[PDB]
């Protein structure tokens, strides 16, 4: 084992001498002379109520108007978000959710949490009612996060460190993704749909290919978990956010990191994390019961959300860039513009 | 608004009617957390998730076991935790001390009340009447420890027996008042595999708690 | 799903009956039900309405005062009841389900009928009365309006039927523009304000019958008169 062991340690010292010969500039130097972006004030135009306790995750529909809410009292909830109107209410067998999703058509939504299984409900049907379509089981821990490619495939990602594509109809695995050393705790897909990235509680991404099964790259800069992470509207970077209480950017064409985003008043976590539709303001959601906008270009704050009474817990921004979605633990949900 | 607004709107409020009817049930039932270890006994005191249910003087419990940094954070809103020690295997309560300072310093449980059962105790009997095993080569503090004066209480039993109790409950009662600022309180208890009257005390504690929940929101305390 | 109903027969004038549906198949107590009728050769006219809840009903200027809705949704039936009956009530009497919410689509299944023989508005026409076509072919069919059916949030309240002989109506295009489950894409329909039309492309047998427009923007539903496509 002496021999593998000096092998690792010298790919390791190769790949890091490869990265450095492949840096001759720093982003904050080639974008010195630009004009800045200003102060961004946005205020409350919606407060959705209904739910008795904590909310835990929450996502649009690509048509922009629909969104689904995920709560610890055992029910998801499909809101109109232009007249605050209930459309759905979908009882649960188990009350411990930590996600949910809606699917692009706007046919099925699904949902998981701390008892291994990710279930799918059918909305539109005759009979009227909304009921189950299918249950996938086969991981051995709790679900973090689940999203829709199509109306046959699915991904999940698992705290037994693993994650799988599913083929719903058979209900069966079709290829299992290895190679992390802790919990796994969000993925986010890419536009064109054969790439996604995931991170985890070992301090490190990594970047796979959905239909060969592989690992291209790992990226490692933080140090403590990470919670949060998202694609570049173009499809070539990511941001991560730890509870370090400090974000980040990576590229994925040079394989480093360019931009890091901490102040020293933040001492707390970072929750969840998001963009905007041109790619230069990037949302995050802290513990300390609020939300900032950051510059993605100059590391500089531009504004603050200041509404919440306990810790944000989600985020969101809809297709067409005309409202960002918030919910928190004192189970309210609020849409800014 | 159009016919078919006004329907969708009345649709809704019907929506938000089984909604309170659903909360107020769920007010009524309180909540319970069971941790514990291997060979402590656990799945026998109240004679993904193993669920529970029982009820004392007309009164609805809930309680939940998973078989940990993350996903403690759900369990954030419970009214206790029960904490269950096997108090015979002398070579593993640095381990089971160890856990309690994890599970009693962490950040999203600084408000949660322990309901500790130090089980197992006939066998600590048997072994501590045996002679052939020194509790003292395991914790070195043992040769210099006496029973308090006035508070030593005991049914009929034996002095020995006594200290070998009272010294385990204070190293877990003294590391719970080391640094908790009074705002959470632990609640020690000794049982055995046969006993029936395990489902009271839990009832006694949840009412002291509620006590105190009351007493702080009207400033009293 | 099923709907079927009962009752029926002769009247004398000034009598009472009492009409009765029952349901099988859905989620009957999230709908709410209408009565639609026909003549013996005319068209459709609307009846009365009740609500999901029982909390809204609706009646016709005509029928007020003399019918009364009612619904028992443990048993799953749905009744009206007459009192003081003429001789312009001889029909043949409908019930209708409806759903409401976003992106729903009301006015899904027709039950089939039951006779009954006893011994301002939004007024909107259909000019055309008949047209002969021969299959393989394109044809269009147009109804306007008194007053526009486009409300300020954007949607056009219209919708169009389709009876073929011996049978009961069925749905084709609820809002003027979407196409309803189980309708093969051969069909479409479009216009503006106060101008509506329906397409139909390679027209075949069993697509010939009598073609209705109504409109859902405001009490009473309003019904046209009926185009009918002859071989």
């Known amino acids: 084992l002496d021999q593998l062991r000096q092998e690792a340690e010298q790919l390791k010292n190769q790949i890091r001498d490869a990265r450095k010969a492949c840096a001759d500039a720093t982003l904050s130097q080639i974008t010195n002379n630009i004009d800045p972006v200003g102060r961004i004030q946005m205020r409350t135009r919606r407060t959705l109520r209904g739910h008795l306790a904590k909310i835990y995750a929450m996502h649009w529909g690509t048509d922009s108007r629909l969104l689904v809410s995920a709560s610890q009292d055992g029910k998801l909830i499909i809101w109109d978000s232009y007249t605050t109107n209930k459309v759905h209410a979908i009882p649960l067998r188990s009350s411990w959710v930590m996600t949910c999703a809606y699917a692009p058509s706007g046919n099925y939504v699904a949902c998981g949490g701390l008892d291994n299984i990710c279930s799918i409900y059918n909305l539109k049907t005759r009979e009227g009612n909304v009921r189950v379509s299918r249950e996938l089981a086969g991981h051995t821990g709790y679900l973090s996060c689940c999203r829709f490619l199509d109306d046959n495939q699915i991904v999940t990602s698992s705290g037994d460190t693993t994650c799988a594509l599913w083929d719903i109809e058979t209900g069966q695995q079709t290829t299992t993704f290895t190679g992390h050393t802790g919990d796994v705790m969000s993925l986010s897909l890419a536009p064109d749909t054969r790439l996604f990235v995931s991170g985890a509680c070992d301090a490190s991404a990594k970047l796979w290919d959905v239909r060969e099964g592989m690992c291209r790259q790992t990226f490692t800069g933080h140090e403590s978990d990470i919670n949060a992470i998202c694609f570049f509207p173009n499809g070539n970077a990511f941001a991560t956010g730890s509870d370090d209480a400090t974000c980040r950017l990576f590229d994925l064409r040079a394989d480093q990191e360019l931009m890091t985003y901490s102040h020293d008043n933040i001492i707390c976590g970072i929750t969840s994390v998001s963009f905007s539709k041109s790619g230069r303001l990037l949302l995050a959601g802290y513990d300390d019961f609020n939300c900032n906008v950051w510059d993605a270009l100059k590391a500089d704050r531009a504004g603050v959300l200041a509404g919440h009474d306990n810790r944000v817990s989600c985020l969101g921004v809809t297709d067409d860039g005309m409202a960002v979605a918030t919910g928190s633990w004192d189970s309210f949900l609020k849409i800014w513009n | 608004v159009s016919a078919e607004d006004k329907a969708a709107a009345e649709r809704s409020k019907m929506i938000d009617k089984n909604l309170r009817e659903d909360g107020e049930k769920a007010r009524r039932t309180l909540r319970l957390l069971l941790l514990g270890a291997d060979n402590s006994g656990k799945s026998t005191i109240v004679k993904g998730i193993f669920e529970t249910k029982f009820q004392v003087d007309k009164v609805n419990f809930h309680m939940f076991d998973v078989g940990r940094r993350k996903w403690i954070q759900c369990f954030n809103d419970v009214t206790a935790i029960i904490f269950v020690v096997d108090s015979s295997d002398y070579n593993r309560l640095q381990e089971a001390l160890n856990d309690f300072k994890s599970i009693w310093n962490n950040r999203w449980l600084r408000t949660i009340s322990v309901i500790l059962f130090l089980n197992k105790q006939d066998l600590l009997a048997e072994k501590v009447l045996a002679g052939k095993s020194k509790i003292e080569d395991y914790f070195p503090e043992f040769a210099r420890y006496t029973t308090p004066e006035d508070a030593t209480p005991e049914p009929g039993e034996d002095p020995r027996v006594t200290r070998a109790k009272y010294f385990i409950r204070k190293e877990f009662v003294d590391i719970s008042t080391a640094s908790g600022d009074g705002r959470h309180i632990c609640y020690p208890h000794f049982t055995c595999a046969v006993d029936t009257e395990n489902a009271r005390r839990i009832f006694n504690d949840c009412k002291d708690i509620i006590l105190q929940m009351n007493l702080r929101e009207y400033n009293l305390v | 799903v099923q709907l079927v109903e009962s009752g029926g027969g002769l009247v004398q004038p000034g009598g009472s009956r009492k009409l009765s549906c029952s349901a099988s198949?859905?989620?009957?107590?999230?709908?709410?039900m209408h009565w639609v009728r026909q003549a013996p050769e005319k068209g459709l006219e609307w009846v009365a309405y009740?609500?999901?809840?029982?909390?809204?009903?609706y009646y016709a200027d005509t029928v007020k005062g003399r019918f009364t809705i009612s619904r028992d949704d443990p048993k799953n039936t749905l009744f009206l009841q007459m009192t003081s009956l003429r001789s312009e009530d001889t029909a043949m009497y409908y019930c209708?389900?409806?759903?409401?919410?976003?992106?729903?689509?009301?006015?899904?299944?027709w039950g089939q009928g039951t006779t009954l023989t006893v011994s301002s508005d939004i007024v909107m026409t259909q000019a055309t009365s008949s047209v002969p076509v021969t299959p393989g072919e394109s044809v269009s069919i147009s109804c306007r309006s008194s007053?526009?059916?486009?409300?300020?949030?954007?949607?056009?309240?219209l919708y169009w039927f389709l009876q073929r002989p011996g049978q009961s109506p069925q749905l084709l295009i609820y809002r003027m523009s979407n196409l309803a489950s189980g309708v093969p894409d051969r069909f479409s329909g479009s216009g503006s304000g106060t101008a509506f039309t329906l397409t139909i492309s390679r027209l075949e047998a069993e697509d010939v019958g009598v073609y209705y427009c109504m409109q859902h923007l405001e009490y009473p539903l309003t019904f046209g008169a009926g185009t009918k496509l002859e071989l």
């Open positions: 009740i609500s999901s809840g029982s909390g809204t009903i």
């Open positions: 198949g859905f989620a009957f107590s999230s709908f709410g």
């Open positions: 209708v389900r409806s759903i409401y919410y976003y992106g729903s689509s009301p006015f899904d299944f």
């Open positions: 007053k526009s059916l486009l409300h300020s949030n954007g949607n056009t309240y």
